[PDB]
Amino acid sequence: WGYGKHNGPEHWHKDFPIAKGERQSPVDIDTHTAKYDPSLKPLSVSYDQATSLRILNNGHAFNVEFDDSQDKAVLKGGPLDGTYRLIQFHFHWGSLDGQGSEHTVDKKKYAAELHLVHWNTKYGDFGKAVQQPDGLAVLGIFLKVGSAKPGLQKVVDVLDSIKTKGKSADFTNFDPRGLLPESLDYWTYPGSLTTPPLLECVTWIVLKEPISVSSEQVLKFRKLNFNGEGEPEELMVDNWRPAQPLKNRQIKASF
Ligand SMILES: CN(C)c1cccc2c(S(N)(=O)=O)cccc12
Numbered sequence: 001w002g003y004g005k006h007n008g009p010e011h012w013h014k015d016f017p018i019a020k021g022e023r024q025s026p027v028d029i030d031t032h033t034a035k036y037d038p039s040l041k042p043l044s045v046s047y048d049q050a051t052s053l054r055i056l057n058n059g060h061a062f063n064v065e066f067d068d069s070q071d072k073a074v075l076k077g078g079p080l081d082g083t084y085r086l087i088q089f090h091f092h093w094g095s096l097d098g099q100g101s102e103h104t105v106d107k108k109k110y111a112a113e114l115h116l117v118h119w120n121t122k123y124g125d126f127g128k129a130v131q132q133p134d135g136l137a138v139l140g141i142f143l144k145v146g147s148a149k150p151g152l153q154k155v156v157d158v159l160d161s162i163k164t165k166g167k168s169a170d171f172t173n174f175d176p177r178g179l180l181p182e183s184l185d186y187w188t189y190p191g192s193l194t195t196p197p198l199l200e201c202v203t204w205i206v207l208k209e210p211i212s213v214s215s216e217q218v219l220k221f222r223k224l225n226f227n228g229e230g231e232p233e234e235l236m237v238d239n240w241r242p243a244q245p246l247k248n249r250q251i252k253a254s255f
Pocket residue numbers: 115117136138192193194195
């Protein structure tokens with residue numbers, strides 16, 4: 001599978017039937033129909049003990065992996081029950097600044113979208129978590145083009161070393177707190193992974209406030225490759241899935 005004409009999102013259902021399921025992501029967030037829920041607790045993000053280990057190009061995007069062997073970087077509160085460990089974060093972006101995000105707000109598309117993946121610790125490991133309706137929690141953050149995000153530069157500079165599919169690089173001491181917006185106000189709904197296997201095990205938490213990154217920073221994202229070394233160059237752009245039908249789901253807002 002991929003994001004091309006012959007293997008893109010519209011073809012995924014053939015190999016992964018769940019693509020046409022009841023709680024698929026992403027979705028369009030209609031701000032006017034979202035239900036303000038006063039019982040939603042504030043988000044608790046404890047990223048001070050985070051330990052980043054490696055950065056890798058997997059052929060669809062690049063991932064920054066964290067040591068999830070202990071409660072070092074955890075997420076809790078909000079609509080969540082229990083503790084969720086940060087295992088990795090990645091992005092989705094477009095070829096142009098007007099597209100790239102997976103979730104949209106009132107049909108509005110952002111330049112990119114950051115996903116911080118966490119798994120429910122009561123399940124022992126990520127692999128067991130993907131077998132539960134509440135096994136994962138993904139924190140989604142929109143990126144818009146404007147001023148440079150200082151905390152993103154270290155990621156942007158290492159991109160040269162993982163240009164092609166399969167390449168990885170040591171990436172220690174990265175602090176994800178530098179990618180967070182000022183406000184933790186959010187929207188939440190039950191969904192799925194946005195890439196195959198598209199499992200419906202995710203509690204999505206999409207932040208209302210976007211972070212700004214510069215044109216130069218976003219440009220470097222667009223210099224990565226979908227292909228492996230030695231193969232014809234396919235620029236890794238537009239690695240996002242279109243919005244899926246909300247179906248029988250309600251989007252709740254913490255505000
Ligand atoms: C398989 N593992 C690593 C995953 C868990 C949860 C979400 C994932 C997403 S996404 N786009 O849904 O956040 C993309 C790729 C892998 C994911």
